[PDB]
Amino acid sequence: SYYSTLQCRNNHGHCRRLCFHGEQWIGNCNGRHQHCCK
Ligand SMILES: CCCCC(=O)OC[C@H](COP(=O)(O)O)OC=O
Ligand SMILES: CCCCC(=O)OC[C@H](COP(=O)(O)O)OC=O
């Protein structure tokens, strides 16, 4: 329930529903529609 979020944040990412301009969607975080944006 936490490891995808942690892996995202440990690899320069932030969990968002929509990535910011210039960010890449590299995986998902935990929780619904929470996307890892780097
Ligand atoms: C508000 C979440 C608090 C943790 C929880 O209830 O566990 C359920 C899921 C488990 O992780 P998933 O990525 O499978 O949703 O956590 C995320 O909502
Ligand atoms: C139906 C579950 C969708 C979760 C997903 O990872 O993929 C779809 C994403 C969901 O994120 P949204 O921000 O669009 O809701 O859509 C991206 O375009």
Numbering used by the authors: 1 to 38
Q: What do the paper's sentences say?
A:
Defensins, a family of cysteine-rich cationic host defence peptides, are a major component of the innate immune systems of all plant and animal species, however crocodilian defensins are poorly characterised. We now report the functional and structural characterisation of Crocodylus porosus β-defensin 13 (CpoBD13). We now show that the saltwater crocodile defensin CpoBD13 harbors potent antifungal activity that is mediated by a pH-dependent membrane-targeting action. CpoBD13 binds the phospholipid phosphatidic acid (PA) to form a large helical oligomeric complex, with specific histidine residues mediating PA binding.
Consequently, we determined the structure of a CpoBD13:PA complex, which was refined to a resolution of 1.45 Å. The asymmetric unit features four CpoBD13 protomers and four PA molecules. Examination of the mode of engagement of PA with the different CpoBD13 chains revealed the presence of two different PA binding sites. In contrast, the type I site features contributions from three different CpoBD13 chains. N30 from chain A and H21 from chain B contact the phosphate of the PA headgroup. Furthermore, the crystallographic symmetry mate of chain B (denoted as B’) also contributes via R9 binding to the PA headgroup. Three additional contacts are formed by S1 from chain A, which forms hydrogen bonds with two oxygen atoms in the acyl chains of PA and the linking oxygen with the phosphate headgroup. The type II site involves contacts of R17 and H35 with the phosphate of the PA headgroup. An additional contact is formed with N28 and a carboxyl group of the acyl chain. Intriguingly, the structure of our CpoBD13:PA complex revealed the existence of large and continuous helical oligomers.
